[PDB]
Structure 1
Amino acid sequence: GSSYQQAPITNQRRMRGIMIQSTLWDMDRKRSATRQRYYPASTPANQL
C-alpha cells in the first residue's frame, strides 16, 4: 500500500500476536472474551 489509513478504533485488535485468530479464536467463543478482542468505541466528549 502506498499510504496507510487507520481503521476505526473498534476494528483494531487489542492482541498483536499474529496467529491468535487460528490458535485461539477459532475455538474460543466465550462472549465476554470475544468482546475484549477489539478496542471499545471512543469519542470526543464534544460529540456526545
Structure 2
Amino acid sequence: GSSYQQAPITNQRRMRGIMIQSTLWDMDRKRSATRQRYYPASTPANQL
C-alpha cells in the first residue's frame, strides 16, 4: 500500500505476537481474556 492509515484504537491488538490467533485465541473462549484482546475506546474529554 502507498501509505498507511491507522485502524480505530478498538481494532488494534495489544498482543503483537503473530501466531496468537491460531495458537491461543482459536481455543481460548474466556470472556474476560477475549475482552482484553483489543484496546478499549478512548476519547478526548471535551468530546464526551
Normalising by structure 2, we get a TM-score of 0.99
d(CA) in 2 for partners of 1:46, 1:12 = 23
Runs of 5+ consecutive residues of structure 1 not aligned to the other structure: none
Quote the residue 1:23 is aligned against: 23
d(CA) in 2 for partners of 1:14, 1:29 = 17
Q: Structure 1 residue 19: deviation in Å?
A: 0.1
Q: Structure 1 residue 22: deviation in Å?
A: 0.2
1:1-43, Cα deviation, whole Å (9 max, x unpaired): 1000000000000000000000000000100000000000000
Normalising by structure 1, we get a TM-score of 0.99
d(CA) in 2 for partners of 1:16, 1:8 = 16
Number of equivalences: 48
